[PDB]
Amino acid sequence: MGHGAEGEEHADFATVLASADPAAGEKVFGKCKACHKLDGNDGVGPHLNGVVGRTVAGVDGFNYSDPMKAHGGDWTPEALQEFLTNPKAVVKGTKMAFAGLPKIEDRANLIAYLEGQQ
Ligand code: HEC
Ligand SMILES: [Zn+2]
Ligand SMILES: [Zn+2]
Ligand SMILES: [Zn+2]
Ligand SMILES: [Zn+2]
Numbered sequence: 001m002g003h004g005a006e007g008e009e010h011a012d013f014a015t016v017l018a019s020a021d022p023a024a025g026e027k028v029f030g031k032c033k034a035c036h037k038l039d040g041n042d043g044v045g046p047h048l049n050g051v052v053g054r055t056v057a058g059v060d061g062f063n064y065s066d067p068m069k070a071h072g073g074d075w076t077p078e079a080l081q082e083f084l085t086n087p088k089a090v091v092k093g094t095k096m097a098f099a100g101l102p103k104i105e106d107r108a109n110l111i112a113y114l115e116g117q118q
Contacts, residue, residue, distance in 0.1 A: 008104050013081055016108040025113025028106045032098070038117045045096060049117045051075050065095045080114070081107040
């Protein structure tokens with residue numbers, strides 16, 4: 001629904017991830033560096049080095065939104081790619097102002113890169 005682009009030509013997310021390209025993910029992360037670092041520093045968003053498997057809303061000292069704090073669970077690869085599909089829909093009232101990664105391979109490639117940034 002709606003009059004914007006919605007097709008995907010590269011389409012089971014686990015299958016997409018298993019063949020992902022971490023160097024391509026390293027470039028997708030450029031879209032997140034204004035807010036997120038991979039050296040443990042926190043800023044507009046919390047650091048994302050070691051996010052894969054981390055408790056949701058877990059970074060010490062970072063002031064998360066109410067729906068993020070109340071969510072529970074961990075950032076598994078499925079959780080991460082669901083949230084990155086369209087943050088504002090997937091966690092209504094998130095404070096992350098990012099439109100999303102509609103390309104399924106961009107999500108899988110970005111998750112594969114974050115897996116190597118623990
Ligand atoms: C303009 C800022 C901005 C951009 C760009 C941004 N985030 Fe975020 N991000 C935030 C904020 C703010 C939060 C905290 C959201 C909340 O508390 O609801 C967050 C939370 C996250 C979380 C939850 C972390 C946790 O510790 O619970 C993940 C995962 C995340 N961003 C991933 C990404 C990725 C991957 C990108 C790039 C594709 C990205 N973000 C781009 C601002 C950004
Ligand atoms: Zn950490
Ligand atoms: Zn701690
Ligand atoms: Zn509140
Ligand atoms: Zn949820």
